[PDB]
Amino acid sequence: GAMVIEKEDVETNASNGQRVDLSSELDKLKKLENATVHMEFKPDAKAPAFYNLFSVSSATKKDEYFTMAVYNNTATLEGRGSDGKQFYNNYNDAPLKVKPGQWNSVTFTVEKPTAELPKGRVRLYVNGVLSRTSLRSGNFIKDMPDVTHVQIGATKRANNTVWGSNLQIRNLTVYNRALTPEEVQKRS
Length: 188
Ligand SMILES: CC(=O)N[C@H]1[C@H]([C@H](O)[C@H](O)CO)O[C@@](OC[C@H]2O[C@@H](O[C@H]3[C@H](O)[C@@H](O)[C@H](O)O[C@@H]3CO)[C@H](O)[C@@H](O)[C@H]2O)(C(=O)O)C[C@@H]1O
Fold this sequence. Notes:
Blueprint: E1 3-12, E2 19-21, H1 26-30, E3 35-43, E4 50-57, E5 65-71, E6 74-80, E7 104-111, E8 121-126, E9 129-134, E10 149-153, E11 155-157, E12 160-162, E13 167-175, H2 181-186
Antiparallel strand pairs: 1-13, 2-10, 3-7, 3-13, 4-5, 4-10, 5-6, 7-8, 8-9, 11-12
A molecule of 3 linked components (BGC-GAL-SIA) binds next to strand 5 and strand 6.
Organism: Streptococcus pneumoniae
Subcellular location: Secreted, Cell wall
Family: Belongs to the glycosyl hydrolase 33 family.
């Protein structure tokens, strides 16, 4: 199949600066056009207001990054290129929330633009259920020329590190195609 990254049973905590570095997998991410990023995780119960689940970021460009994040329990998503402009529509007020202190999954899919999807397609699902679809772009890591770092948890944006939290991560899986809603229902 389509699996290009799988990381199991890792965690972010004080001892690792609330971060699991995956930056060695950056070239695999840059190559993707259609993609899925899936995480199954358990946040500590009284979570920070904003915390990153999976991000790609830059040592030189503070505002160029991709993040799947949680904001006041809402599963959210943002990608910004070398001009700092948004790749996707706002997800901060997307309808689906995670339950901290328990197991949850969040799945992001991206489809590059095609004849029938002229601006591409991005979806975020929470616990197998579509939260929001965004048809602004199908931009992804291939569209971020200055990225250097990949991580679960605390995210290095140039000379600052932000969005850390304590997470148990049963798995992070990245695929080289966009799973369908039906696959997200069964494969989560
Ligand atoms: C998904 C999401 O909400 N992303 C926003 C992000 C997060 O809410 C926070 O990081 C969570 O803690 O906040 C961002 O804004 C915070 C930073 O703004 C920077 O200044 C901006 C300024 O506010 C802009 O209006 C201006 O046009 O450009 C400046 C340079 O970036 C500050 O310099 C920085 O210290 C923070 O205050 C973020 O970038 O983190 C915006 C995300 O969209």
